[model samples]
Target: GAMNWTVDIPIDQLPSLPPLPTDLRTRLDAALAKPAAQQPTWPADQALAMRTVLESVPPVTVPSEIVRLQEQLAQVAKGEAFLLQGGDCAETFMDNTEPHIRGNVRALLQMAVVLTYGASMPVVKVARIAGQYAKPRSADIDALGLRSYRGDMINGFAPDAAAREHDPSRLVRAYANASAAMNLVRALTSSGLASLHLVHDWNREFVRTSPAGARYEALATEIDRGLRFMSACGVADRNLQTAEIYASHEALVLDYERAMLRLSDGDDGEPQLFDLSAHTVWIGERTRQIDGAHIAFAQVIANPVGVKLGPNMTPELAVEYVERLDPHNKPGRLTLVSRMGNHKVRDLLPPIVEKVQATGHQVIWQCDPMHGNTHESFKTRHFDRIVDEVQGFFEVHRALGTHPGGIHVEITGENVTECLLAGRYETACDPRLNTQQSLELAFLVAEMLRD
Candidate 1:
């Protein structure tokens, strides 16, 4: 179960390596050279060696899949679909096993099914899986006076200098783990794992046993009747047997993202750089500086990108990001995420929404009711406050006549309580809602989506 001291994966010295027209090459080089945030302290030579290997490795995701997600997200952008995104805050290499991957996938899909029924619209499912390894830390060092545990992709989580040193070998390992997990996700979603009936049944089991089960019973039965009615109508099983779940992560590390970047087939006669690390990537709150490298790199790529807007964000700067990253103004090509805490969401969100709406871009307005709501003293988040933020999210969108597109959270298929500061709150960074909490939140979001 241990990892390699070096990257043993095959590397092709040719094909898909760095090669582009002078203009595209110039732009990419310029973007890479910009001041990048939260990058590892890897040596130049070692980092280059890893990047050289990754530049030629087969990509984790394909162009068509990325295109498909954008189309689905466009539906979300147009107020026709809802997005339910959740997974580990940081996916460790040790836990990147099939059971762990499947459990996380199952929980996310279960939530999506519930949301689909609740909102009476499609739920574009995206998981913070596969490439969700590296994290953006608030400090350079931790409580032990050691380097901060960046993530499995940047450094080991063990509490020692040797393990914490920024190791470039992890770049390839992250790619390996990401692609492998993506392969399994493809296999599972196309199988019974995501079948509408199967996923709904899992929700049924949850509703049958939850303490809040009585409250959710009506909706659960309503969904069951809908499923039964469809089956009675001779709707084929194959039609409901599969679903789509997209992969995503923060586009934080420039070397990893840059190496994963490749040229598109130029269907329209001009090419674009696509980050094949994940189908859709987002710039974190710390990395979303309007003129920073993360924002600039996101601008150059064709994949739909999300920019996190914290409480400090201004209407003008939010507008600047919208225009800069999405200059072409494609629907669903940009998602502006609001992480304002519950107390501030009602007061702070409307102005930004109003200003951005005036731009005539159909961007998805997703709420991340997690990051801004953490209780460090307790090392957890309360259920009431979590739901309160979504309440505020929907209220603001209802007032502004904008689509409250979806939510972004860190969650699992395990367990948690209303005040889950005790028992198994094992996270090194963000405290995630366990399975019941996630399902309960899904029900809340579903109700809010309709409200």
Candidate 2:
């Protein structure tokens, strides 16, 4: 059965993806040079615990089944005939209306829809809305693919229950990727870009559970049971791991409000990170051909999945899962992958990095200044001292040899009004960063750049 539905969301109607703040680059440079290093010691016991877990990460690699999936994706990337279907078994238990969270999740989906399909494409959002069937709707997507505008299918599912149960205080931590996508969708369709209003709705309980009922709990429990059965059969339980990667990607996209353009560190200070001009051309060409609008991409490292939940699930497991998605062995798809620094899990990073390299694929990692978990000592801190160290890590990668060719920044185009920079203006402050005094924090960081 073919279904043709077009939703004309005018350009004006679809707000711009928030722009990078004017002072972001300046602040980044300052942070790079500051001596304010906050290094915490990794507890001896925890270090040993992590080591034990890393050792147990089975000498695993990508399997043939995933290789086939990559091949199929590559064909699509190359404009080869293929069907873009919508059937993710993970979305059965996801709740979209949670307070302070829905907007971000919805915004993510909106962006994904625009980038994957096109703005004008008739979009169909498929979900387990009450009595909906569990099967996928690829036939509909195939029919929509033929139209002028592309269609996108949003899948909402719980990727990790432990993450949800572990950190209830953090608004974004519980839902991971699914929650992020839900927030994005809400931002796109709702009244405005600022998250305050959306956050207001997120705080309401009936608003959270009524429309969909508490069905997600049952769906999640069932999924978990199924996972346990598979684990018994020696199959690694990677559903949660997958959720972590997507969640990390979602976090990076939502938290940052800037278009990260890499410039060189040479005497001339030209943009020499990785044939930036050429890369831009390639990105532009691909987006224009497919999306009819500009699209952006970035690299993420160590998307944290399960933490201390049995031996089989670990960060290394996350790395192995990414390795399997590499395009060389699979060939032809542009998949997202990352690399890590010489930290606790340095050994694990190389094996996964090498696998991608063997296939002639370029693997790159970023310095997470916002959350400096890359450093061993920064383990328990709210934020780490290596904000500058992370920036230096970026420079080392640029200076070492080849450019990772990845963008990492946090900026929003909308006029943010939650948290202020340095506490200067209480009004129009970004809700996430907190106070105007924070503006100086970001400003100082921008001043330290060499290029």
Candidate 3:
């Protein structure tokens, strides 16, 4: 199976790693360790069984692809590339169908086109899918004596008390769903779905009918014409026609991730542990405690990792994280995703960037405008006031002379009503960027970056 794809390195050839500190090792041992959020309440035996299942299964991804992405991200860290990362806030088990997966990938491709052509930069596309089955809860227990629904991996999202109970068996289900989704993703991407020649085909009817879609249509026409002209001039290249798509998620559940870890040989003929779950994984803001279990678990993985930095984060903390996470200063080894609110970003982010930069560690700087700008209204929660926050992110980066390497968002291709407005909407509103809105925003941001 590995021989079929030339893009991936053989599984056995990844680099070997040294042991972690005893404290970190012990913290990793306990699945219910502190600072680990959204973990399921698995019985001891069931958890062991789940881990065994994961160990026996094939990994979702390989080490070579992760290394490839890290090299690409190295360019982003150096201001030579741009990253466009987005997907659903939390992937539901039911939403793992082919149509849903295709829709999300289509939306991402459309946005990538806009960013690539508009900004005239290499856009690295990473979707928060496949392994995005876990979600963090604000509280450990609900009023009905039920533990929080960690995600599809833990329990159902129904309001009933029974549905909220954690089930260890769901870990297997989560892995199966993730595998199915990834299967379709690989198929679609490897097919003509992600071809530059078929860029306009990825658009939904609503997107094509919208004003933003019209502008995208024009850009697509231009791109198509250029391709044809190049072909006529004997410049036909297969590599230019297709693109690469990467998978990522919050590495919230350590058990699932750890179970997927495998030893592979590096180019230098050393053994390395790779989290075969996804191409990239991020440590969420809530679980990024320096001495916390999440951080300790992340420190050992060979994949390119990201850490969420909130408004409360200090320059000292930022530096400390960089030193620990990417002590070797590898270019694409680390990414800092800043999620400070619109009002706080301008004040809080500059010093952190300045301090981290002063440390000479090459880290990609990304903006997570959704989490910080989200708020709850009377009926539903929504990502309100996002424009200002994104603008603020750009401004802060511009003023501080740092590269704004990317934007991370919780978006979907489906037009589900998930966001709420100021009592004006009857049904739940979708706060995330739909296809048209995403393209428009991409164009706008590209213009701002150009200026």
Give me the candidate number with maximum TM-score: 1
TM-score of each: 0.96, 0.27, 0.86
Point out where model 2 deviates above 4 Å: 1-99, 102-323, 327-359, 368-379, 382-386, 404-450
lDDT (Cα, tens digit) per residue for candidate 3, span 346-425:
89998999999998888999988877876544423343456567788899889988898899977777764435334332
The candidate 2 region of ten consecutive residues with least summed lDDT is 276-285
Per-residue lDDT for 303-341 in model 1, tens only? 999999989999999999989988888889999899989
C-alpha local distance difference test of each model: 0.87, 0.26, 0.76
The full ranking of all candidates by TM-score, starting with the best, is 1, 3, 2
Best by lDDT: 1
| Better TM-score candidate (2, 3) | 3
Evaluation by TM-score, superior candidate among 1 and 2: 1
* Model 3 segments more than 4 A misplaced: 1-35, 141-146, 201-208, 211-241, 266-268, 378-384, 418-431
Error of 1 at 169 (Å): 0.3
Tens-digit lDDT track of model 2 for 1-451: 1354422222233333333344534544333233311111224443333333322222111123223333433443333312111112112233223432333333332222221222112222212111111122213222223211110112212233332121111211222333344344334444343222232232222223443324323332333354356567776523322210011122111111011223233443332221110111111111111111112121111111111111122445434433443323433333322223224223333343344444454333322333223222211222223234334443554454333222222222222332212332221101222211122222223222223
Tell me the lDDT of candidate 2: 0.26
Candidate 1: C-alpha lDDT: 0.87
TM-score of candidate 2 against the unseen true structure: 0.27
